Design an enzyme around this catalytic site. Structure first.
Site, short mmCIF file in Angstrom:
data_model
loop_
_atom_site.label_atom_id
_atom_site.label_comp_id
_atom_site.label_asym_id
_atom_site.label_seq_id
_atom_site.Cartn_x
_atom_site.Cartn_y
_atom_site.Cartn_z
N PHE A 174 0.81 3.90 -0.37
CA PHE A 174 0.06 5.08 0.71
C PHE A 174 -0.29 4.91 1.87
CE2 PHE A 174 -4.01 7.97 3.15
CZ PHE A 174 -2.93 8.92 3.56
N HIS A 207 0.57 -1.17 0.04
CA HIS A 207 0.18 0.19 0.03
C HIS A 207 0.39 0.88 -0.10
CE1 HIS A 207 -4.03 -1.81 0.88
NE2 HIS A 207 -3.00 -2.46 2.16
N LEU A 214 -23.42 6.73 9.36
CA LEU A 214 -23.99 7.43 8.42
C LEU A 214 -24.24 7.63 6.65
CD1 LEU A 214 -25.42 10.81 9.66
CD2 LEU A 214 -26.54 8.38 10.20
N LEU A 223 -5.73 10.52 -6.29
CA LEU A 223 -5.97 11.99 -6.05
C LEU A 223 -6.80 11.97 -4.29
CD1 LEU A 223 -7.00 15.25 -5.93
CD2 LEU A 223 -8.86 13.70 -7.71
N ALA A 224 -7.37 10.37 -4.19
CA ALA A 224 -7.45 9.96 -3.00
C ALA A 224 -6.30 9.86 -1.52
CB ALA A 224 -8.35 8.63 -2.75
N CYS A 243 -15.38 10.75 -2.34
CA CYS A 243 -15.47 10.60 -3.51
C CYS A 243 -14.41 10.91 -4.62
CB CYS A 243 -17.28 11.01 -3.72
SG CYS A 243 -17.69 10.11 -4.82
N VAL A 244 -14.53 10.03 -4.97
CA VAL A 244 -13.25 10.61 -6.74
C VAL A 244 -14.32 10.31 -7.96
CG1 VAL A 244 -11.42 10.01 -7.79
CG2 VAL A 244 -10.60 11.11 -5.54
C1 LIG Z 1 -6.37 12.87 12.12
C2 LIG Z 1 -7.22 12.67 10.82
C3 LIG Z 1 -6.82 12.09 9.95
C4 LIG Z 1 -8.54 12.60 8.44
C5 LIG Z 1 -8.03 11.36 8.14
C6 LIG Z 1 -8.68 10.10 8.80
C7 LIG Z 1 -8.59 8.56 7.46
C8 LIG Z 1 -9.27 8.93 6.98
C9 LIG Z 1 -9.75 7.39 5.54
C10 LIG Z 1 -10.93 7.44 4.67
C11 LIG Z 1 -11.83 7.18 4.95
C12 LIG Z 1 -13.17 6.40 4.04
C13 LIG Z 1 -14.26 6.97 4.57
C14 LIG Z 1 -15.37 6.30 3.20
O1 LIG Z 1 -15.67 7.22 3.28
S1 LIG Z 1 -15.92 4.41 2.91
C15 LIG Z 1 -16.14 5.50 1.27
C16 LIG Z 1 -15.31 5.10 0.10
N1 LIG Z 1 -15.99 6.21 -0.87
C17 LIG Z 1 -16.21 5.71 -2.43
O2 LIG Z 1 -16.13 3.70 -2.59
C18 LIG Z 1 -17.22 6.32 -3.53
C19 LIG Z 1 -16.69 4.79 -4.27
N2 LIG Z 1 -15.21 5.17 -4.55
C20 LIG Z 1 -14.55 6.27 -4.69
O3 LIG Z 1 -14.81 7.93 -4.77
C21 LIG Z 1 -12.98 6.08 -5.18
O4 LIG Z 1 -12.79 4.51 -5.61
C22 LIG Z 1 -11.75 6.32 -3.81
C23 LIG Z 1 -12.65 7.38 -3.84
C24 LIG Z 1 -13.01 5.32 -2.51
C25 LIG Z 1 -10.35 5.87 -4.11
O5 LIG Z 1 -9.75 6.51 -5.16
P1 LIG Z 1 -9.82 5.81 -6.05
O6 LIG Z 1 -10.35 4.67 -6.41
O7 LIG Z 1 -9.07 6.97 -7.54
O8 LIG Z 1 -8.17 4.90 -5.98
P2 LIG Z 1 -6.46 6.85 -5.49
O9 LIG Z 1 -5.49 5.70 -6.99
O10 LIG Z 1 -7.61 7.62 -5.66
O11 LIG Z 1 -5.82 6.28 -4.29
C26 LIG Z 1 -5.41 5.05 -4.08
C27 LIG Z 1 -5.52 4.51 -2.89
O12 LIG Z 1 -6.86 4.74 -1.48
C28 LIG Z 1 -6.66 3.95 -0.87
N3 LIG Z 1 -8.24 3.69 -0.91
C29 LIG Z 1 -9.44 2.75 -1.33
N4 LIG Z 1 -10.59 2.84 -1.31
C30 LIG Z 1 -10.60 3.66 -0.01
C31 LIG Z 1 -11.15 3.87 0.59
N5 LIG Z 1 -12.47 3.13 0.84
N6 LIG Z 1 -10.89 4.19 2.19
C32 LIG Z 1 -9.37 4.74 2.48
N7 LIG Z 1 -8.89 4.55 1.25
C33 LIG Z 1 -8.85 3.73 -0.08
C34 LIG Z 1 -5.96 2.86 -1.81
O13 LIG Z 1 -6.63 1.46 -0.79
C35 LIG Z 1 -4.59 3.35 -2.20
O14 LIG Z 1 -3.76 3.03 -1.12
P3 LIG Z 1 -2.56 2.79 -1.08
O15 LIG Z 1 -3.00 0.77 -1.05
O16 LIG Z 1 -2.38 3.02 -2.71
O17 LIG Z 1 -2.10 3.04 -0.12
CL LIG Z 2 -23.77 2.43 5.62
#
Ligand SMILES: CCCCCCCCCCCCCC(=O)SCCNC(=O)CCNC(=O)[C@H](O)C(C)(C)COP(=O)(O)OP(=O)(O)OC[C@H]1O[C@@H](n2cnc3c(N)ncnc32)[C@H](O)[C@@H]1OP(=O)(O)O
Ligand SMILES: [Cl-]
Ligand SMILES: COc1cc(C)c(S(=O)(=O)Nc2c(C)nn(C)c2C)c(C)c1C
Length: 411
Positions: free
Chosen positions: A4, A2, A411, A170-171, A160-161
């Site tokens: 990231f 991973h 939610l 971008l995520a 959401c991307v």
């Molecule tokens: C102190 C405060 C802290 C604040 C932050 C706290 C943490 C918050 C964390 C987020 C909490 C979210 C809670 C919810 O909302 S969960 C719901 C997530 N949303 C969706 O599923 C909507 C449909 N999908 C998309 O929009 C995209 O596919 C998303 C945005 C999900 C990924 O975009 P994309 O597919 O274009 O990929 P990339 O190339 O840009 O990025 C690739 C990297 O992203 C990692 N990835 C994939 N899926 C998720 C996922 N659900 N959580 C975290 N990371 C995820 C993946 O392992 C890879 O990393 P690595 O394996 O290379 O390392």
């Molecule tokens: Cl849910």
């Protein structure tokens, strides 16, 4: 592997979290002063935007992005269609920080391309009870109790991307920038959930579904007709008959919550949530915001007897777009929200949830096996679904726990 998540303060393997004993942070301790004041660099064609959540048109732009690009099932049959009113309710709880709502726009057209949201939550997240037990055994009770006070942290959702921009890394950038805005407000932990496996969950719970409209559910392929139904004359009349429900609730003195119920509901909820290892703490204002009825959004009923609220339940609505069936636009789903029972069996309370949900036109009642949700599955005829909701902390070592020790509803 991973590229990231391997750079982030989270446990990296099942093997690390199956070892953890005490709650506590992962990172070096830092200060707001350590945290860059400038937003994270992005390419020159994009810009960062903070949506205004009291602006109908900003909400709408987020609504459209989510409608077309948010959570799909694995078979691309359903996608969430959170309403605008739902988005305003979820993104603006009391004392929300607007800065925690993070969006990437295209500089030229201002087309919204990515989003992520954090809202504040006060979460109990100290060592779980079974581990506190071992700690006493071992003389290590003080280490185990160190992070027992409820913590004001950040709850992440709605990542959401845009479809066109996927797999372009971008995520990670959205996540770093959200992290930055939150650390700038002196918050160091976050809690989030996902339908996918990431490093590394502290709990995992299966989905359960309760058909309210089985004919529609079978037509859109949410549901199968079991084989055992074929060795029947008329499969579909049997199914409908099996899931049928009373038209009116059975508990006398059930009514919708009103503002005056807030303190009693708060008290009965907090007493109940107190028995779980991980759970939120809510003030009066958060009980009103999260539980008072708002039409199309959240639905909340109390049992009042003798001017005393002794029981309540709540559910919220998320319709899903039915992607490949063109006879139906939407699956109308009710999600079990918080509840507490002190006067009647939980299955008796929740039967009224089903009854109300069905009479108001919902197609299905959904829930994850947290709280005491397992206790009414068989009697109310919920069946396991094929999904799991995994629960995660950012910057927080936490031992594995069962989903029935989680009392936070997402939610
Ligand atoms: C102190 C405060 C802290 C604040 C932050 C706290 C943490 C918050 C964390 C987020 C909490 C979210 C809670 C919810 O909302 S969960 C719901 C997530 N949303 C969706 O599923 C909507 C449909 N999908 C998309 O929009 C995209 O596919 C998303 C945005 C999900 C990924 O975009 P994309 O597919 O274009 O990929 P990339 O190339 O840009 O990025 C690739 C990297 O992203 C990692 N990835 C994939 N899926 C998720 C996922 N659900 N959580 C975290 N990371 C995820 C993946 O392992 C890879 O990393 P690595 O394996 O290379 O390392
Ligand atoms: Cl849910
Ligand atoms: C958060 O993750 C999930 C959420 C739901 C709601 C489910 S689900 O009920 O089982 N199905 C479902 C419906 C009706 N709409 N969407 C968008 C999805 C994924 C599942 C399988 C998962 C993995």
């Amino acid at each position: 592997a991973h590229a990231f998540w391997s750079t982030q303060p989270v446990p990296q393997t099942e093997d690390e979290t199956e070892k953890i004993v005490f709650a506590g942070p992962m990172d070096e301790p830092k200060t707001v002063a350590d945290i860059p004041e400038e937003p994270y660099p992005i390419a020159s064609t994009f810009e960062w935007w903070t949506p205004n959540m009291e602006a109908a048109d900003d909400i709408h732009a987020i609504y459209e992005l989510l409608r077309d690009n948010y959570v799909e099932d694995d078979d691309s049959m359903f996608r969430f269609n959170y309403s605008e009113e739902f988005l305003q309710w979820a993104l603006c709880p009391p004392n929300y920080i607007p800065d925690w709502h993070v969006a990437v726009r295209r500089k030229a057209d201002k087309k919204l391309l990515a989003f992520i949201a954090g809202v504040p939550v006060t979460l109990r997240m100290g060592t779980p009870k079974y581990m506190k037990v071992k700690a006493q055994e071992k003389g290590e009770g003080e280490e185990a109790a160190k992070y027992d006070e409820p913590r004001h942290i950040c709850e992440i959702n709605f990542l959401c991307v845009h479809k066109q921009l996927r797999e372009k890394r971008l995520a990670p950038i959205l996540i770093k920038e959200a992290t930055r805005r939150v650390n700038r407000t002196n918050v160091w932990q976050a809690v989030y959930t996902a339908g996918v496996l990431l490093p590394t969950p502290y709990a995992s719970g299966q989905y359960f579904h309760r058909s309210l409209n089985p004919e529609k559910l079978v037509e859109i392929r949410f549901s199968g007709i079991p084989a055992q139904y074929q060795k029947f004359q008329n499969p579909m009349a049997m199914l409908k008959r099996n899931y049928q429900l009373p038209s009116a609730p059975k508990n006398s003195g059930l009514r919708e919550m009103k503002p005056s119920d807030v303190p009693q509901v708060r008290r009965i909820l907090m007493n109940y949530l107190d028995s779980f290892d991980v759970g939120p703490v809510f003030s009066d204002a958060e009980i009103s915001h999260y539980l008072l009825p708002r039409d199309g959004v959240v639905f909340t009923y109390v049992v009042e007897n003798d001017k005393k609220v002794t029981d309540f339940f709540s559910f919220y609505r998320i319709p899903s777009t039915v992607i490949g069936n063109s006879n139906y636009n939407l699956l109308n789903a009710a999600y079990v929200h918080y509840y507490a029972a002190t006067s009647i069996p939980l299955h008796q309370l929740i039967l009224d949830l089903l009854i109300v949900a069905h009479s108001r036109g919902f197609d299905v009642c959904n829930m994850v096996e947290i709280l005491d949700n397992r206790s009414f599955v068989e009697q109310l005829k919920f069946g396991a679904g094929d999904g799991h909701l995994r629960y995660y902390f950012y910057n927080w070592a936490y031992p594995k726990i069962k989903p029935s020790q989680v009392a936070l509803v997402m939610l």
